[PDB]
Ligand binder design. Structure first.
Ligand SMILES: [K+]
Ligand SMILES: [K+]
Ligand SMILES: [K+]
Ligand SMILES: [K+]
Lengths: 214, 214
């Protein structure tokens, strides 16, 4: 249908098995089962293409591949160059987050469609404080006001392309995909997600993934 | 010598054994071994007093007890009423953080002594963003600028007492001990600590504690 997924996956921690399946395939299959998703552009080294290639005939999406870049936004840009010319949303996901819920992907897809840009997030749990160059607390930031960003980050393609034109033209710096949209003064909605949508990096995260998958 | 510790410890997660020792005793012993610490005022239900009471003769501090309160700042206030009348610093610690390093306690003690108030913190790892009442990103907060707060929080007693007088007189709200000091417009130094100084709440944290203790 209308959404193009850019799956970022470029032994690497995202191919470490979780219940004997590479971590990257969990989110991959989650997107493939959703009626809204037309295609998945996978961003990975050609070494690991086989891992996704095996299931092309089963899954109900058109599959594509793109070459990774030196940095995270370079990979997204490479991914972006492959999508259907009529895709209505780009859904950018980090494969190191295997536990993303179908329900939460649906939510951020809807919010992305309504607002133009949206990202899954959860309230920042820890007491965070603003600190200046002299290591002094500037103020305690309001606890309602702070949110941890996860993925997917969902952005209209025209918006993302226009955003990439600005970044390149003025050598601008980027954290995440929605930071690109922030430069445009176009709104970014934070869709409330789940604390379970963790990023798996350490062995303690890997064990955590299993305990949630139970 | 000059520091009074207020240990907050009021089956509760802080008495769950870590390598067969209740989590609360780890930090307790760490403070007891430091020449700067004169006394430890433990804040716990009288049920659990025995857990600390057993080691009174071994440890080189004067031990004290205080009754917990309905909220976290009520317990700190109860703890505060017991300290030596000549203590130069109050070192407030959450017993659910057993892995605090001697070296990091030394650092925050020094910074507390120099500034009047100090707290151990580490750079906030996740991409945090400011979000308004309409769930829209206000701005992406600078990555140098955000820090997670741990404990100890170290405060001069006169400062803390004066801070408690303000909070009570104007029914003011509090997150942490240093937020009390922030109301006073007195500076709070953030002493750079260690990511290992985690708070143990879940079984995955408990497993994490063990893996660091190795
Ligand atoms: K589909
Ligand atoms: K992590
Ligand atoms: K001592
Ligand atoms: K936790």
């Amino acid at each position: 249908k209308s959404v193009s997924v850019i799956l970022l996956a470029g032994m690497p921690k995202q191919y470490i098995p979780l219940l004997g399946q590479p971590i990257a395939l969990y989110s991959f299959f989650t997107f493939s089962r959703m009626p809204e998703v037309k295609e998945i552009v996978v961003v990975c080294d050609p070494f690991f293409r086989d891992i996704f290639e095996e299931y092309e005939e089963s899954i109900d999406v058109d599959l594509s591949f793109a070459i990774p870049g030196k940095e995270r936004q370079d990979s997204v840009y490479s991914g972006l160059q492959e999508i259907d010319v009529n895709s209505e949303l780009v859904c950018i996901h980090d494969s190191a987050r295997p536990l993303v819920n179908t329900e939460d992907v649906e939510k951020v897809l809807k919010d992305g469609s309504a607002v133009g840009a949206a990202v899954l997030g959860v309230p920042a749990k820890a007491t965070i404080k603003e600190v200046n160059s002299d290591s002094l607390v500037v103020k305690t930031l309001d606890r309602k006001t702070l949110w941890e960003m996860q993925t997917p980050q969902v952005i209209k393609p025209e918006l993302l392309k226009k955003g990439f034109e600005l970044v390149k033209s003025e050598g601008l710096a980027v954290t995440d995909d929605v930071s690109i949209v922030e430069y445009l003064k176009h709104p970014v909605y934070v869709s409330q997600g789940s604390y379970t949508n963790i990023k798996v990096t350490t062995p303690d995260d890997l064990l955590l993934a299993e305990r949630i998958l139970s």
